[PDB]
Amino acid sequence: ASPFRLASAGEISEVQGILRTAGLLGPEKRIAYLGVLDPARGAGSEAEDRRFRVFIHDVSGARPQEVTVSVTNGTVISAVELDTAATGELPVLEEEFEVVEQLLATDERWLKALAARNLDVSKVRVAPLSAGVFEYAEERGRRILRGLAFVQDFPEDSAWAHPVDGLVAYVDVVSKEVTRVIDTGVFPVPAEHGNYTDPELTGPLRTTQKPISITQPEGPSFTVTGGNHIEWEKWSLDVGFDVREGVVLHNIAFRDGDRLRPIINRASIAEMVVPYGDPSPIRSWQNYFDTGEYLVGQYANSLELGCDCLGDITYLSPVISDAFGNPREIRNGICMHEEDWGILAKHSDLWSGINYTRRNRRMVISFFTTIGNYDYGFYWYLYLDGTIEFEAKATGVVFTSAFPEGGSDNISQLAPGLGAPFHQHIFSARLDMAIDGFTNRVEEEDVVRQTMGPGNERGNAFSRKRTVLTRESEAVREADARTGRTWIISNPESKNRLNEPVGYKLHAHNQPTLLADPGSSIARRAAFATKDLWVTRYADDERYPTGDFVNQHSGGAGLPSYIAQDRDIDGQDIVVWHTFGLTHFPRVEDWPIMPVDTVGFKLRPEGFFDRSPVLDVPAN
Template sequence: MTLQTTPSTPLVQAPPVLATLVQAAAQHPLEQLSAEEIHEARRILAEAGLVGESTRFAYLGLIEPPKTARQGDVTGAARLVRAMLWDAARSRSLDVRLSLATGLVVDRRELNPEADGQLPVLLEEFGIIEDILAEDPQWNAALTARGLTPAQVRVAPLSAGVFEYGNEEGKRLLRGLGFRQDHPADHPWAHPIDGLVAFVDVENRRVNHLIDDGPVPVPEVNGNYTDPAVRGELRTDLLPIEITQPEGPSFTLEGNHLSWAGWDLRVGFDAREGLVLHQLHHSHKGRRRPVVHRASISEMVVPYGDPSPYRSWQNYFDSGEYLVGRDANSLRLGCDCLGDITYMSPVVADDFGNPRTIENGICIHEEDVGILWKHTDEWAGSDEVRRNRRLVVSFFTTVGNYDYGFYWYLYLDGTIEFEAKATGIVFTAALPDKDYAYASEIAPGLGAPYHQHLFSARLDMMIDGDANRVEELDLVRLPKGPGNPHGNAFTQKRTLLARESEAVRDADGAKGRVWHISNPDSLNHLGHPVGYTLYPEGNPTLAMADDSSIASRAAFARHHLWVTRHAEEERYAAGDFVNQHPGGAGLPAYVAQDRDIDGQDLVVWHSFGLTHFPRPEDWPIMPVDTTGFTLKPHGFFDENPTLNVPSSAAGHCGTGSEREHAAPGGTAVGHSGPDTGGQGHCGH
């Protein structure tokens, strides 16, 4: 990765040959692919006769060294690359592995599209679908009947899924819904063209099927949220907030190795998964201990709940079909990230196998998050308070109408948290009537179908080593009786999840259900296994019928928890090839082996997400909605590990006249140091 700290002078790049030599001399095997390595991978594939004019790169990424090979000094280990190649001229999908060290292809497999599915959607295909439809007589006739021309219509390139429509097996498909765009800066999501959908064979460049039920009035609302006529006058009552760290941030970043407040890890990035955190360790009282070997969001799916023939097929795997990492944004200081920011600029391959740098694609910073701990004790005469802070590693991606932020948080007390931030524009439709059961009216005549945003976190646990286990912890209410005369007693029940078949579980808010991940071979000073507890939000799982196509393809989202024995090839919750896969891949196939997971090297998969019944307030652009999970140390430390956090610097939490003023009504308002002020402008 390319590293840039902002604000700073841009780094001077070494000449390509020198840069390659320097990198080769010190490269860690988990350093992400460089532009030079992507060029080299493409060259190797071309020399092997696998790249021609019609070849496109659906995915290219690093094959990480096996977990067992990463424990010692493996600097300079052979670098392997995985490439997924689509050749439209030959109607061929290849899954290829190659060695950068030997310059040779080490493995290749041709996919059977009916059994294996298709490779991910290409960026090139976003435009191809519009080109195909612009030349299709049926599509043009449908637009003419609506008083439209192809030049006025944008077509959303939507993954097809697998359904019982005719003449689709084995074909590379997209489905297209149209939106009228009134001028180049117009947001077409305000003007859905309903009653019309095209099923497009992008491989053979033809329309496979068209559903046209006749013209439906196109909503005429204005969705241009920056238009003064829509937004109104800008507010003038928001004073600046300025985040400053005069001595710089508390973390260090060397290559992709990040260290902060006892934490150290390696920051990775993948075109499919986006951010990947490797080798999370925590050091306390001179002891460095592993916690999580690899953490990523392995999949996310957005299924829609409208059964109309125009939308009943809508479900999008934003990771496996669209590659959230490839679609990552370049971030701007003061807008996307605020404060003393360090950026990383990952490099991905484009459709032609050439490197593309996502400038400032990863944001790293620390932020104040309120009180860490506090107590005023009259008996001891003490009054102590400590401020909390967290390290934030994040990126943002745009997949069609939606934008997602992926935020990993590390805390001073050893807590790990993930938060997804969903924003952007809700998918729209012309509302059939105000009482339509499957969509919300968000503006006059404009509907937003009900849908979900469901994620799967893959947590390759390594709490004090590989021997880990998972127990389910439930609150148990006890009835009145001889041992509970006042009826106030409650306790906690522990259930060991010993095999994969036993570890497909759902959250239960009524029982306060959590899952404790521990190492039975490592005991704390109380004699209990050290561990971490996974706290789920417990939001709804996949809402679709159990025998639906999407339930088979997104089976991971049917349950909140899955636990599997570690296997290098089991990387994705919905399987390797998601696009048009018939279903059953991923977690259902993994757990079918029913392996022993008690005291084993295991992977915890956590499904979580949002069920979205859109509101009028979500239009014309949606305020951020959040979902996520928390991993908290539970017996991992012998006591509160933040007792050594110093109190705030002198003068930063005082009560002198320079630190406070009286608000209306006489309430004292304090200003606690340099983390207040104003940063109102986006920088670069």
């Protein structure tokens, strides 16, 4: 009965039937995106209307369409033809992954390039890479993918160990034309394999690890109702899943005695981008938006008990649409479990003689996705003490190149002849805030140093200052680790027992933001990534920091266009967008498969409660 329930297979089947009866899903059509729409503001009408948004691609070259459908009423609500040269191309389809390699295999220019390198075309894998927007006028309004080649010596071989450098091709996947083949010179193909399950590379496996058994003899402490509603240790929330964003958290709230207190209305990773910093023309165009161009949700892994998720695991299996509108279940795509998290609070008092120890724990909601060479784990954590944390875990195989004779300022060497270009992994968290309700504001908090002098005679004093962000034009903020800069989201109309506004403090990791030159194509298309924090006024259609159609969009969509409205954000329904990321100079230890590295952020209560919220935790 909840409007935030997961999409069912039955809903997706009805969407397919509605689209087909309306004449919108003929044999040349493909569904490139399908997702449920959140309830509009003011859902207290109980009048549920389950609506779905669909992007429909046409493989014959007709204009694609954006369609909204009501499963509740069985009707098409709206259908709009898209001009893709204006508003952007549709996301990459899974079925286009193979098309690039197949089209190149019959192109005479591609074959001559492989012939010169004595490479058998049957052994050459071609990565299907998003194209961006650069200097090529013929690409405007065409659906382009770019290909980079890797050799597979045999079917189980890791192709990433054998990049074919000096060669790139561009393909129009709708007209099935190879537009350009660029060959800048022969590089030796690196010869060592990267097969991390080969005994000659691993050596004998360790026999020294003894098992760790994690069990819950009485079952977990959380309950799941209505398919995706979680209650755990005073937390309450709904776990959503969207094929673009992946796991989405709705209605995060905390039961403080009598009252269910909202904190966050919607939390998601709304974009991620991996820009490459190698100036070679073979790769200088390379920036993939895994979320906006490829859709990370559709590549979620099925997670195995004991391997991917350890302990007493409750799974969700979300349903998505395939390219023809058939429902497809992602079995065991989301793991949920609680974890011991060490000491929560501890004190032994010299005067009262009381010794006190309590243990912490956290609720984990996670999924893993794989897009080509890269794999990412997305983890949301809820802690007993009111802290909310996100963590991204990056692993997989690094993207490789040749390592040039005489070195490089922009590529790491991993093995003889084998390089890995410098790059970043940058995420955007979209936090639709609801601290004790929807009237919120953001303050920037800096440490203040004070000079020795009158009123500070011993030169020991220090303080803090808070600046309220009142309009969108002043709400684009940068980190400052040296001044301990954080941001507080508060509700000016809801006070704690000390008559102070209740709030939550955002703690960033303060990692570098986008390094590209501000005049670059990627700086225009990924403008969100150039600043640490943005605040906007809530609006239904402002969903992604990069706009709705990221693929081959020429730039400036999303957050820079939103904030130009310069709306009031001082005690209003607001959205925080936090940019955070890893800058990756690959190391030898990242090869041939990379140990996990992590980045994230957290929010801690700041006068939200009237005292510690974990006084009622028992003594184990």
